[PDB]
Design an enzyme around this catalytic site. Sequence first.
Site, PDB file in Angstrom:
ATOM      1  N   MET A 194      35.974 -48.327  60.233  1.00  0.00           N
ATOM      2  CA  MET A 194      36.537 -48.981  61.417  1.00  0.00           C
ATOM      3  C   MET A 194      36.399 -48.040  62.622  1.00  0.00           C
ATOM      4  O   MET A 194      36.613 -46.835  62.483  1.00  0.00           O
ATOM      5  CB  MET A 194      38.005 -49.365  61.194  1.00  0.00           C
ATOM      6  CG  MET A 194      38.512 -50.357  62.204  1.00  0.00           C
ATOM      7  SD  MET A 194      40.269 -50.168  62.521  1.00  0.00           S
ATOM      8  CE  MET A 194      40.931 -51.366  61.398  1.00  0.00           C
ATOM      9  N   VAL A 195      36.038 -48.589  63.797  1.00  0.00           N
ATOM     10  CA  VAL A 195      35.849 -47.816  65.028  1.00  0.00           C
ATOM     11  C   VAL A 195      36.893 -48.182  66.086  1.00  0.00           C
ATOM     12  O   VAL A 195      37.139 -49.360  66.340  1.00  0.00           O
ATOM     13  CB  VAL A 195      34.401 -47.927  65.583  1.00  0.00           C
ATOM     14  CG1 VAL A 195      34.150 -46.917  66.704  1.00  0.00           C
ATOM     15  CG2 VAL A 195      33.360 -47.762  64.476  1.00  0.00           C
ATOM     16  N   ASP A 249      16.501 -45.932  60.669  1.00  0.00           N
ATOM     17  CA  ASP A 249      17.252 -47.141  61.012  1.00  0.00           C
ATOM     18  C   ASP A 249      17.375 -47.331  62.546  1.00  0.00           C
ATOM     19  O   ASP A 249      18.436 -47.698  63.061  1.00  0.00           O
ATOM     20  CB  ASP A 249      18.613 -47.193  60.285  1.00  0.00           C
ATOM     21  CG  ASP A 249      19.248 -48.578  60.243  1.00  0.00           C
ATOM     22  OD1 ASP A 249      18.494 -49.578  60.227  1.00  0.00           O
ATOM     23  OD2 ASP A 249      20.499 -48.660  60.241  1.00  0.00           O
TER      24      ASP A 249
HETATM   25  O1  LIG Z   1      28.190 -44.483  64.371  1.00  0.00           O
HETATM   26  C1  LIG Z   1      28.515 -45.307  65.217  1.00  0.00           C
HETATM   27  C2  LIG Z   1      29.073 -44.846  66.443  1.00  0.00           C
HETATM   28  C3  LIG Z   1      29.461 -45.780  67.415  1.00  0.00           C
HETATM   29  C4  LIG Z   1      30.040 -45.409  68.736  1.00  0.00           C
HETATM   30  C5  LIG Z   1      30.243 -44.074  69.125  1.00  0.00           C
HETATM   31  C6  LIG Z   1      30.701 -43.868  70.420  1.00  0.00           C
HETATM   32  N1  LIG Z   1      30.969 -44.899  71.226  1.00  0.00           N
HETATM   33  C7  LIG Z   1      30.780 -46.155  70.834  1.00  0.00           C
HETATM   34  N2  LIG Z   1      31.020 -47.200  71.727  1.00  0.00           N
HETATM   35  C8  LIG Z   1      30.873 -48.623  71.377  1.00  0.00           C
HETATM   36  C9  LIG Z   1      31.681 -49.486  72.372  1.00  0.00           C
HETATM   37  C10 LIG Z   1      31.421 -50.992  72.161  1.00  0.00           C
HETATM   38  O2  LIG Z   1      30.015 -51.294  72.037  1.00  0.00           O
HETATM   39  C11 LIG Z   1      29.266 -50.543  71.064  1.00  0.00           C
HETATM   40  C12 LIG Z   1      29.389 -49.043  71.387  1.00  0.00           C
HETATM   41  N3  LIG Z   1      30.319 -46.394  69.614  1.00  0.00           N
HETATM   42  C13 LIG Z   1      29.260 -47.165  67.163  1.00  0.00           C
HETATM   43  C14 LIG Z   1      28.718 -47.553  65.993  1.00  0.00           C
HETATM   44  N4  LIG Z   1      28.342 -46.653  65.018  1.00  0.00           N
HETATM   45  C15 LIG Z   1      27.824 -47.185  63.738  1.00  0.00           C
HETATM   46  C16 LIG Z   1      26.536 -48.002  63.876  1.00  0.00           C
HETATM   47  O3  LIG Z   1      26.068 -48.257  62.556  1.00  0.00           O
HETATM   48  C17 LIG Z   1      28.961 -47.907  63.043  1.00  0.00           C
HETATM   49  C18 LIG Z   1      29.240 -49.265  63.260  1.00  0.00           C
HETATM   50  C19 LIG Z   1      30.352 -49.860  62.676  1.00  0.00           C
HETATM   51  C20 LIG Z   1      31.197 -49.078  61.898  1.00  0.00           C
HETATM   52 CL1  LIG Z   1      32.600 -49.761  61.165  1.00  0.00          CL
HETATM   53  C21 LIG Z   1      30.950 -47.727  61.695  1.00  0.00           C
HETATM   54  F1  LIG Z   1      31.800 -47.008  60.928  1.00  0.00           F
HETATM   55  C22 LIG Z   1      29.831 -47.138  62.275  1.00  0.00           C
END
Ligand SMILES: O=c1cc(-c2ccnc(NC3CCOCC3)n2)ccn1[C@H](CO)c1ccc(Cl)c(F)c1
Length: 346
Positions: free
Chosen positions: A27-28, A138
């Site tokens: 989760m992000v 990827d």
């Molecule tokens: O490793 C990352 C880092 C980020 C990241 C890092 C900094 N900033 C933002 N901002 C976001 C704001 C909204 O739009 C997208 C960028 N994202 C986003 C995705 N991921 C991967 C891709 O596979 C990911 C996706 C889902 C889950 Cl669950 C996860 F664990 C990992």
Amino acid sequence: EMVRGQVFDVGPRYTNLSYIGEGAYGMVCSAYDNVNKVRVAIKKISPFEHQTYCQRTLREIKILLRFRHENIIGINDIIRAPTIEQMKDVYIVQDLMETDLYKLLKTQHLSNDHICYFLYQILRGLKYIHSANVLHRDLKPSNLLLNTTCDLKICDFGLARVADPDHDHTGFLTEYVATRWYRAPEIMLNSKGYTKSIDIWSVGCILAEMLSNRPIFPGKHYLDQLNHILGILGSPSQEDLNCIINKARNYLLSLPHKNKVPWNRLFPNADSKALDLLDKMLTFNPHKRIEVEQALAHPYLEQYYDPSDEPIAEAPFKFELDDLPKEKLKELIFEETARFQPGYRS
Ligand SMILES: O=c1cc(-c2ccnc(NC3CCOCC3)n2)ccn1[C@H](CO)c1ccc(Cl)c(F)c1
């Protein structure tokens, strides 16, 4: 503390949390960093129940902690329990990005100029990856994080590998390589996921997607994927068929003769220089495919190309992990994230 469902427990440094996204084992969230006085992204990852998930977590931590480049996302901090027994989740803190290329292409048609500088940034980042003897494996719009037209970062090194061009053709069902739509034909035909060429093909697909706001090869499954490739590139030549190592030559020889659709028929509003580079990137034969340094020196990117401002790795990267049980990978993840713990010696 918790973000609607799952607990976060990143405090007292990281507060005022807001949900971003989720997956099978992660989760992000965005969070306020009370130290750097700025908003950051925090990736809560719980991979320890599955060996592959552990491989992807370790893979991305080892690589991103060694890499330092403007076009590659970094790792700012890692939150994890003080003991292996207590460790169930790993929190990866990274710079917060506004969006990604996938989301952008859903709402905006990119100008030639923007595409150009986005392409340059991807390739600038890739030059560093490849100089480290590393393959992303990827590359796709959703792994291209954005803030502005001048700020792009490659993310998700979960599938990354050290380039081993002279290694065993493994097995078709043994490893997950690229996301199908961005998967090079050598991966599908003769299970070759350990050469730099696979990344240039992915970039080619991304460039074609920026030019039309739709994927160039949207196959349902891998045979449909090859049919889509063949639908534009045309039926492969005898020399191109000799590179096919597998049964694999059969279904292709079973298909009717497909003519090469000219790029300008597919993309009439695109710059001829962009379409010339796209042609070199999307070459069916990996041996004839353009390399990262050659793509950067292509006339399409002549206004940005600057070898003295394109950093390369100080030394090639070294780690195998795919044959290790999930318990040993948990131990290696614990060791790799130890730097970010209090009392860390050596
Ligand atoms: O490793 C990352 C880092 C980020 C990241 C890092 C900094 N900033 C933002 N901002 C976001 C704001 C909204 O739009 C997208 C960028 N994202 C986003 C995705 N991921 C991967 C891709 O596979 C990911 C996706 C889902 C889950 Cl669950 C996860 F664990 C990992």
